[PDB]
């Protein structure tokens, strides 16, 4: 599923991401935009042989099991395929764990390089939240 911007903003808010660990909803929408282009089915192989999954590009080296990432963890206790579903529940639950892990939203490289310090409130412009 390729979410709309305000559609994703509304789902993210419903699932309790707006201000989670102090990160405003615009930060989360901005991260999703530059991680996945709002596509729940996005996958990207990493140089270490892990893969990033879903609208928030969650990594198989730590967070989910894809069966092909040796000596990896599964700290969200889910198959990586669960993070590709039209329903963002599993990606949101797992993202809450990631952002709580110590480095906050710096865990998302597209957030750090393209959203951090910018006018992220622009990402929820015009949305009836
Ligand atoms: Na894994
Ligand atoms: Rh929920
Ligand atoms: Rh819920
Ligand atoms: Rh960690």
Curated annotation (Swiss-Prot):
Catalytic residues (UniProt): 35, 52
Keyword annotations from UniProtKB, A to Z: Allergen, Antimicrobial, Bacteriolytic enzyme, Disulfide bond, Glycosidase, Hydrolase, Secreted, Signal
PROSITE patterns with a match to the protein in the record: GLYCOSYL_HYDROL_F22_1 (PS00128), GLYCOSYL_HYDROL_F22_2 (PS51348)
GO biological process, one term: killing of cells of another organism
Top-rank taxon: Eukaryota
Binding site for substrate: 101
C-type lysozyme domain residues: 1-129
Chief location category: secreted
Sample GO molecular function, one term: lysozyme activity
EC number(s) from the headed UniProt entry: 3.2.1.17
Expressed in which tissues: In the egg white and polymorphonuclear leukocytes.
Cysteine-cysteine disulfides: 6-127, 30-115, 64-80, 76-94
Localization: Secreted
Pfam families tied to this protein: Lys
GO cellular component: cytoplasm; endoplasmic reticulum; extracellular space
Catalysed transformations (reactions): Hydrolysis of (1->4)-beta-linkages between N-acetylmuramic acid and N-acetyl-D-glucosamine residues in a peptidoglycan and between N-acetyl-D-glucosamine residues in chitodextrins
Subunit structure as annotated in this protein's UniProt entry: Monomer.
Described purpose of this protein according to its UniProt entry: Lysozymes have primarily a bacteriolytic function; those in tissues and body fluids are associated with the monocyte-macrophage system and enhance the activity of immunoagents. Has bacteriolytic activity against M.luteus.
The family this protein is said to belong to: Belongs to the glycosyl hydrolase 22 family.
Additional remarks: Lysozyme C is capable of both hydrolysis and transglycosylation; it also shows a slight esterase activity. It acts rapidly on both peptide-substituted and unsubstituted peptidoglycan, and slowly on chitin oligosaccharides.
Protein name: Lysozyme C
Organism, scientific name: Gallus gallus (Chicken)
Source organism phylogeny: Eukaryota, Metazoa, Chordata, Craniata, Vertebrata
């Amino acid at each position: 599923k390729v979410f709309g911007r305000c559609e994703l903003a509304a789902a993210m808010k419903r699932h309790g991401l707006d201000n989670y660990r102090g990160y405003s909803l615009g930060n989360w929408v901005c991260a999703a935009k530059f991680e996945s282009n709002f596509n729940t089915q996005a996958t990207n192989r990493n140089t270490d042989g892990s893969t990033d999954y879903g609208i928030l590009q969650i990594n198989s080296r730590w967070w989910c099991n894809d069966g092909r990432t040796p000596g990896s963890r599964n700290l969200c206790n889910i198959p990586c395929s669960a993070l590709l579903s039209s329903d963002i529940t599993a990606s949101v639950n797992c993202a809450k764990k990631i952002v709580s892990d110590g480095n906050g939203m710096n865990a998302w490289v597209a957030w750090r390089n393209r959203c951090k310090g910018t006018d992220v409130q622009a990402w929820i412009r015009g949305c009836r939240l």
